[PDB]
Design a protein around this motif. Sequence first.
Motif, PDB file in Angstrom:
ATOM      1  N   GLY A  36       0.767  -1.242   0.000  1.00 15.95           N
ATOM      2  CA  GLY A  36       0.000   0.000   0.000  1.00 15.95           C
ATOM      3  C   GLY A  36       0.795   1.286   0.000  1.00 15.95           C
ATOM      4  O   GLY A  36       2.020   1.259   0.127  1.00 15.95           O
ATOM      5  N   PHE A  37       0.085   2.422  -0.129  1.00 15.17           N
ATOM      6  CA  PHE A  37       0.681   3.752  -0.138  1.00 15.17           C
ATOM      7  C   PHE A  37       1.297   4.096   1.226  1.00 15.17           C
ATOM      8  O   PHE A  37       2.292   4.809   1.292  1.00 15.17           O
ATOM      9  N   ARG A  38       0.728   3.576   2.316  1.00 18.95           N
ATOM     10  CA  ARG A  38       1.279   3.787   3.658  1.00 18.95           C
ATOM     11  C   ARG A  38       2.532   2.930   3.934  1.00 18.95           C
ATOM     12  O   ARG A  38       3.171   3.143   4.959  1.00 18.95           O
ATOM     13  N   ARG A  39       2.908   2.018   3.020  1.00 16.65           N
ATOM     14  CA  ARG A  39       4.087   1.157   3.114  1.00 16.65           C
ATOM     15  C   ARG A  39       4.074   0.342   4.400  1.00 16.65           C
ATOM     16  O   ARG A  39       5.014   0.436   5.197  1.00 16.65           O
ATOM     17  N   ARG A  40       2.991  -0.416   4.634  1.00 19.47           N
ATOM     18  CA  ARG A  40       2.887  -1.213   5.849  1.00 19.47           C
ATOM     19  C   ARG A  40       3.405  -2.629   5.625  1.00 19.47           C
ATOM     20  O   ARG A  40       3.242  -3.195   4.543  1.00 19.47           O
ATOM     21  N   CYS A  41       4.039  -3.197   6.646  1.00 23.18           N
ATOM     22  CA  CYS A  41       4.588  -4.544   6.584  1.00 23.18           C
ATOM     23  C   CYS A  41       3.465  -5.548   6.862  1.00 23.18           C
ATOM     24  O   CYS A  41       2.815  -5.489   7.910  1.00 23.18           O
ATOM     25  N   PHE A  42       3.251  -6.477   5.931  1.00 27.92           N
ATOM     26  CA  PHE A  42       2.255  -7.528   6.120  1.00 27.92           C
ATOM     27  C   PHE A  42       2.910  -8.886   6.241  1.00 27.92           C
ATOM     28  O   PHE A  42       3.611  -9.297   5.333  1.00 27.92           O
ATOM     29  N   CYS A  43       2.592  -9.621   7.308  1.00 29.56           N
ATOM     30  CA  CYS A  43       3.078 -10.977   7.541  1.00 29.56           C
ATOM     31  C   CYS A  43       2.258 -11.958   6.775  1.00 29.56           C
ATOM     32  O   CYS A  43       1.038 -11.855   6.736  1.00 29.56           O
ATOM     33  N   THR A  44       2.921 -12.889   6.123  1.00 25.81           N
ATOM     34  CA  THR A  44       2.264 -13.883   5.309  1.00 25.81           C
ATOM     35  C   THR A  44       2.425 -15.279   5.825  1.00 25.81           C
ATOM     36  O   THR A  44       3.464 -15.615   6.392  1.00 25.81           O
ATOM     37  N   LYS A  45       1.423 -16.114   5.540  1.00 25.88           N
ATOM     38  CA  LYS A  45       1.433 -17.539   5.839  1.00 25.88           C
ATOM     39  C   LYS A  45       0.285 -18.257   5.133  1.00 25.88           C
ATOM     40  O   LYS A  45      -0.651 -17.615   4.686  1.00 25.88           O
ATOM     41  N   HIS A  46       0.349 -19.586   5.044  1.00 30.88           N
ATOM     42  CA  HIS A  46      -0.702 -20.365   4.393  1.00 30.88           C
ATOM     43  C   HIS A  46      -2.020 -20.230   5.148  1.00 30.88           C
ATOM     44  O   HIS A  46      -2.020 -20.088   6.383  1.00 30.88           O
ATOM     45  N   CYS A  47      -3.136 -20.230   4.401  1.00 36.83           N
ATOM     46  CA  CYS A  47      -4.466 -20.135   4.991  1.00 36.83           C
ATOM     47  C   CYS A  47      -4.881 -21.520   5.472  1.00 36.83           C
ATOM     48  O   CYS A  47      -5.351 -21.635   6.628  1.00 36.83           O
TER      49      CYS A  47
END
Length: 47
Positions: A36-47
């Motif tokens: 995003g424009f706010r440059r936020r860190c998103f953690c990823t993992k399998h659903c």
Amino acid sequence: RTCESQSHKFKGPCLRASNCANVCKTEGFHGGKCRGFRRRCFCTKHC
């Protein structure tokens, strides 16, 4: 399928993706991406 959740630990803007992913490992996640424009860190993992 990959699920995302905004990092609870990452501070400031996310400019390098592997930094977000390394901070995300300490939260129990597989990887992480800047988003995003706010440059936020998103953690990823399998659903």
